[PDB]
Write a protein that binds this DNA or RNA. Sequence first.
DNA 1: TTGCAGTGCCCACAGAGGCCAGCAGGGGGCGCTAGTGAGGTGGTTTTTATATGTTTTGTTATGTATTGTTTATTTTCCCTTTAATTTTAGGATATGAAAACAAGAAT
Length: 100
Amino acid sequence: TFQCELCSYTCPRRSNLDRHMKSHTDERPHKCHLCGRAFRTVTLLRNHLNTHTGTRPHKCPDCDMAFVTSGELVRHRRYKHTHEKPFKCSMCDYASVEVS
DNA sequence: TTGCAGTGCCCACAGAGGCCAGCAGGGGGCGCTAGTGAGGTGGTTTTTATATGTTTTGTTATGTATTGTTTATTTTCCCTTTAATTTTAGGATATGAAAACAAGAAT
Ligand SMILES: [Zn+2]
Ligand SMILES: [Zn+2]
Ligand SMILES: [Zn+2]
Ligand SMILES: [Zn+2]
């Protein structure tokens, strides 16, 4: 029912349309007090500051290294600890942690 | 000793193959982020629900009006007895009208 004007975005929640309009309008009100980089939400700026300094809270349960976000630890476990490999190739027997 | 037939040696430029940097092939692991997606919390209203006040409905009691009841004073229908009232002779009256007499008038 809900439709977009800038693109063919179709959702059922008005709040989803609101966020999509915020993405089109690029409301970035969160700057970094070290570099000119800016973001739209607080968690992005929090991770950016957790990269300018070493304050990595997501610790690896199987080794002693760490990362700022969860997805990086997910893929680290699928590379090094639980070799998942969901996506597989066409001809060869290849598979890896990322679609890239 | 020489000409001829056959050998020795020294060089050198090719020929060859290992040495080497350069460079491209497939694949493993990390740094970082935009953008949804979903889930949880807070606010809002809202909707159901509950309780109070007012009014409407139902019930009760009293007074008035209607129908009925045996008196009860008309009233009215029906007797036997008078009290006017009417009808029928019977005698008397009256008022008329001829009748006779008397008085003018004529012949
Ligand atoms: Zn759009
Ligand atoms: Zn910065
Ligand atoms: Zn690890
Ligand atoms: Zn393949």
